[PDB]
Amino acid sequence: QISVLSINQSLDYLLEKGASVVRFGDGEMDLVAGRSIVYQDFDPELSARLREIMSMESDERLMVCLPDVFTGLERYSIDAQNFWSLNHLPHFLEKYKNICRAPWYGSTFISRPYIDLEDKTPSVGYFAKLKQLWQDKDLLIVEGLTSRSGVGNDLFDGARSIKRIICPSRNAYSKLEAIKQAVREHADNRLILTMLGPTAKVLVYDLVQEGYRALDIGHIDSEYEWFQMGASHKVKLSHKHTAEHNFDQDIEFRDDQAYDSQIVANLA
C-alpha cells in the first residue's frame, strides 16, 4: 500500500531537486529483522540506524528509496518475481507496512536498472540519466576494496575528476567513524558517491546532516557491466566484485593505474 516511484520518476526527482539519495533493499530489511547478510554481520547499532532512516520522509534534501515491489511485479524477471512474491514479502511485508509510513519513497532499483527488468529496452535511458548526475562533476567515490566501480568500463568517464575512499569489502560499519573522517578530509566540494552496502545508508544520512550531497548508488557497476555485455544472467566477473556474488571468492584485480591514482585513503 506503500507508494514507490518508478526509476524514471526517481531519477527525474534527483535531476530536478539535486537531492541526496539513500536506498533500502532486501538486505537492509534482513538486518532490520535481526539477520546478517553476506557482506555485513548483524550489528544492533547498525540495524537501529537503518530502522530509523527507513521511517523518514523524502524531500528536496534527501530522497529515501524502497524496492518497487508492492505492485506490478510483472515488470521483473521470473526469478526476481519469485524472490519478492514468494520469499521476501511473505516474511517482511508487515515490517515494511509498519515502519515505512511516509507519503512516498524513491525506487531502490535506480541502482538496479537492467538485469532483473523483464523488458530491457528502457535501460539505456536509465543509465543515461544516471550519468547526468555526475557529468562534469568532481567526484568522491566511497566504496569497498573489491567494488572497483567504473574500473574497466566508461561509467564515470564523463566526470570531471575522481577521488576514492577505499573501505572494507565487508563489515564496513565497524569503521564508519573512520570513513566519515576520511570523507571530511577529502570531499572539498565534490559530489560523493557511495557503494558500501548497509554502511552506505548511514553514511549518506550522516553526511547530509553535515551539508554534503551524497548518492547511494550501490551495485550500479555490476548492472552496467551486464548491460554492456547484453547479459541474460548475473554472470560473475573475475576481476572485481559482482552483484549477488557477495562472498567475493575468486577475484584477482587487473592492474589499473588510473584507479590506483584516484585513491586518497584506504581503510580496507
Using CB under 6 A, list all residues that contact ligand UDP: 23, 25, 27, 39-40, 111-112, 143-144, 146-147, 167-172, 195-197, 199-200, 218-219, 241, 243
Rounded CA separation 66/134 (Å) = 22
Question: Residue 37 or residue 130: which is nearer to a second copy going by CB?
Answer: 130
Rounded CA separation 115/230 (Å) = 9
Amino acid letter, 187: A
Residue 165, beta-bridge partner list: 142, 265
Quick one: what does residue 158 bind among a second copy, ligand UDP, none, with the CB cut-off 5 to 8 Å set by partner type?
Answer: a second copy
How is 126-153 classified by DSSP, letter by letter?
A: HHHHHHHHHTT-EEEEEEETTT-TTTTS
Query: CA distances (Å), 265 to each of 60, 77, 168, in order?
Result: 30, 39, 12
Rounded CA separation 186/138 (Å) = 11
Which residues here bind a second copy, judged by CB under 8 A? Answer: 8-9, 11-12, 15-16, 121-122, 124-125, 128-129, 131-132, 135-136, 157-158
Quick one: what does residue 200 bind among ligand UDP, a second copy, none, with the CB cut-off 5 to 8 Å set by partner type?
Answer: ligand UDP
Question: Residue 23 or residue 190: which is nearer to ligand UDP going by CB?
Answer: 23
Residue 69, beta-bridge partner list: none
Quick one: what does residue 11 bind among a second copy, ligand UDP, none, with the CB cut-off 5 to 8 Å set by partner type?
Answer: a second copy
| Annotated binding residues | 23, 39, 111-112, 144, 147, 168, 172, 197, 201, 219, 241
State the nearest-atom distance from the C-beta of 125 to a second copy, in Å.
4
State the nearest-atom distance from the C-beta of 9 to a second copy, in Å.
8
State the nearest-atom distance from the C-beta of 90 to ligand UDP, in Å.
20
Closest CA relative to residue 177, chosen from 155, 156, 202: 202
Closest CA relative to residue 36, chosen from 198, 250, 179, 174: 198
| Annotated binding residues for UDP | 23, 39, 111-112, 144, 147, 168, 172, 197, 201, 219, 241
Question: Residue 123 or residue 146: which is nearer to ligand UDP going by CB?
Answer: 146
